[PDB]
Design a protein around this ligand. Structure first.
Ligand SMILES: [K+]
Ligand SMILES: [K+]
Ligand SMILES: [K+]
Ligand SMILES: [Mn+2]
Ligand SMILES: [Mn+2]
Length: 134
RNA sequence: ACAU
DNA sequence: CGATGT
């Protein structure tokens, strides 16, 4: 119904899918960029969306913030809930980096706790998420 | 079909 | 038009 403005919004950007992947997190209210991941040479849209949420969780936990996280990715929200990124991307030398980060994100989820609500950004009602790359 |  | 996902 209503946007929870006191929140963090995350999004992925890519050049190709699979292709170069990056992500960032922004204050939903102001658009201030709070974190930005250095581009990863080969990844998928969904792996980046997943890494972005998990980074948000870690960022908010480190700062003792109870703000929710918005993502527009049905897929990544489910992968975080499951603590398992069910990506189809081949594992090889050129995808080793993204797969390491994904494995490490799953590992963090399996060894830490959080109460952070992970919320679907309702693009059809609200427009593009504030972290979008345009 | 829906989410990207 | 292509791809990643539930
Ligand atoms: K964009
Ligand atoms: K979108
Ligand atoms: K499809
Ligand atoms: Mn997105
Ligand atoms: Mn976007």
């Amino acid at each position: 119904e209503e946007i929870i403005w006191e929140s963090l919004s995350v999004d992925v950007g890519s050049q190709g899918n699979p292709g170069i992947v990056e992500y960032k997190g922004v204050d939903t209210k102001t658009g201030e960029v709070l974190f930005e991941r250095e581009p990863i040479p080969i990844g998928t849209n969904n792996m980046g969306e997943f890494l972005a949420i998990v980074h948000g969780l870690r960022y908010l936990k480190e700062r003792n913030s109870r703000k929710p996280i918005y993502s527009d990715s049905q897929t990544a929200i489910k992968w975080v809930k499951d603590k398992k990124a069910k990506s189809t991307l081949v594992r090889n030398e050129e995808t080793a980096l993204i797969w390491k980060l994904v494995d490490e994100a799953e590992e963090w989820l399996n060894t830490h706790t959080y109460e952070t609500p992970i919320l679907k950004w309702q693009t059809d009602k609200w427009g593009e998420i504030k972290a979008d790359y345009g």
